[PDB]
Design a binder for this molecule. Structure first.
Ligand code: IWG
Ligand code: MG
Ligand code: ZN
Length: 313
């Protein structure tokens, strides 16, 4: 309980910034995650023996895929840490505990394919879960790991606190289904602009946590350009494999996923920034002003994509 985690000076400082990259050293990621829980939640939230055993089982159940991997898990958890630390007083003890774990768990056992490819392939998980297929599986895998012996990091909570924190985690993980984001953001837009947004309304908190999750999940677009550009290779590597697998089912994939249409990428990024990323962080900055740096970074990268098209890089 007196055993703090410390980072090197550069990481100690950089980690507090939204645009922080967790680095190429896999063996430091678990200490980074624990450092973030201890500062975000307190050194008292989790039994360190249990948290460390949870972290390593969660790492184990991420696959070696180009993008939806252990590094993504921690990257997304760091973005939530930054949001939580810049909005200290707006979130309950349970929400701080639950959301960092939700982020670490949000993509558990991802295979590299969209809900859409699971449905066209007729994957057993598409029969077990008709909507938000991969996201119901991710939450399902989270509960499994929490239920391993020595892995219940919530064991010191009351029965009711426990049901609250698994409910926070379930909503949070489901909300990373980008299909649900559009509607969630429009409702939040309307509530903020007709002034009816109320953070004491549980149904309204749910929506705001949902948007935070979408924000953390898309935070690749909020890094400094060299990080954003290199992550896009990993993102597109998964997309083109899925495209290849669509072709194998005798279905032309959308151009985004067709590796014969690499030319179309920069325009596809534009569409994504304009349709998804900028709207996401605009609405998030309105509800949570201290998250503006995410919007500013996302804007800078939209501009960097415009320069790619114009042949200036
Ligand atoms: Cl740059 C970026 C980040 C996240 C995205 O959403 C995803 C959904 N599933 N895997 S990645 C993007 C989708 C298209 C183009 C760019 C994207
Ligand atoms: Mg996901
Ligand atoms: Zn994700």
């Amino acid at each position: 309980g007196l055993m703090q985690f410390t980072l090197p000076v550069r990481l100690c400082k950089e980690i507090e910034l939204f645009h922080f990259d967790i680095g190429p050293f896999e063996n430091m990621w678990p200490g980074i995650f624990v450092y973030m829980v201890h500062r975000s939640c307190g050194t008292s939230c989790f039994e360190l023996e249990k948290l460390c055993r949870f972290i390593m089982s969660v790492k184990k159940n991420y696959r070696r895929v180009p993008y939806h991997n252990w590094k993504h898990a921690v990257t997304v958890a760091h973005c939530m840490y930054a949001i939580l630390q810049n909005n200290h007083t707006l979130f309950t003890d349970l929400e701080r505990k639950g959301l960092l774990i939700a982020c670490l768990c949000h993509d558990l056992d991802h295979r590299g394919f969209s809900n859409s490819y699971l449905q066209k392939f007729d994957h057993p998980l598409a029969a077990l879960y008709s909507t938000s297929t991969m996201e119901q599986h991710h939450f399902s895998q989270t509960v499994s790991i929490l239920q391993l012996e020595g892995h219940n990091i919530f064991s010191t909570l009351s029965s009711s606190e426990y049901e609250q924190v698994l409910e926070i985690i379930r909503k949070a993980i489901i909300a990373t289904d980008l299909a649900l984001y559009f509607g969630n953001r429009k409702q939040l837009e309307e509530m903020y602009q007709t002034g009816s947004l109320n953070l004491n309304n549980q149904s309204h908190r749910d929506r705001v946590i949902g948007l935070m999750m979408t924000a953390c999940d898309l935070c690749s677009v909020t890094k400094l350009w060299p990080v954003t550009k290199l992550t896009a290779n990993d993102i597109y590597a998964e997309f083109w494999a899925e495209g290849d697998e669509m072709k194998k089912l005798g279905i032309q994939p959308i151009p985004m996923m067709d590796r014969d249409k690499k030319d179309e990428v920069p325009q596809g990024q534009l569409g994504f920034y304009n349709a998804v990323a900028i709207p996401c962080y605009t609405t998030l900055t309105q509800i949570l002003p201290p998250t503006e740096p995410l919007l500013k970074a996302c804007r800078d990268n939209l501009s960097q994509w415009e320069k790619v098209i114009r042949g200036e890089e």
